[PDB]
Amino acid sequence: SNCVADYSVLYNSASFSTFKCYGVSPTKLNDLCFTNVYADSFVIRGDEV
Amino acid sequence: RKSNLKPFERDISTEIYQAGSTPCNGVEGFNCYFPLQSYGFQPTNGVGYQ
């Protein structure tokens, strides 16, 4: 929070595995901006994607 | 979608949608998005998804 939504570097990272979106579109990323983000960062097993 | 849609224009292009900076060029690859998706036509679903 408390920061400009720089969703460009959040998106163009080519080190991904599978691009899965659940509630939002990928074309208005830098346009549409949010209020607060509560991230859940954890490591999973390979067959759990 | 790539083009800006005009009303009442039939489009039959099955062109590979490029995700980022991946030149697909006829074949698939790293997130070469194939936009021609498929319908779920089953009686297994509900009554509003038919």
Residue B29 and residue B22 in contact, taking contact as beta carbons nearer than 8 Å: yes
Q: Given CB atoms, is A4 within the 8 Å cutoff of chain B?
A: no
Q: Given CB atoms, is A22 within the 8 Å cutoff of chain B?
A: no
Contact B31 A12 (CB under 8 A): no
Contact B21 A14 (CB under 8 A): yes
Query: Half-sphere exposure (CA, 13 Å, Cβ side) for A16?
Result: 13
Q: Measured between alpha carbons, how far is residue B40 from residues A6, B10, B33, B46, B49 in Å?
A: 37, 22, 19, 11, 8
Sequence-distant (≥ 6) Cβ neighbours of residue A49 within 8 angstroms: A17, A18
Tell me the two tokens of residue B19. 């995700």
Q: Given CB atoms, is A14 within the 8 Å cutoff of chain B?
A: yes
SS3 content of chain B, % helix, strand, coil (to 5): 0, 10, 90
Give the Cα separation of B22 and A36 in Å (integer). 32
Residue whose C-alpha is closest to residue B1's, from A26, A8, A21, A12: A26
Q: How far is CA B35 from the centre of its chain?
A: 2
For chain B, the first-to-last Cα distance in angstroms comes to 24
Which of A7, A10, A16 to mutate against chain B (most B CBs within 10 Å)?
A16
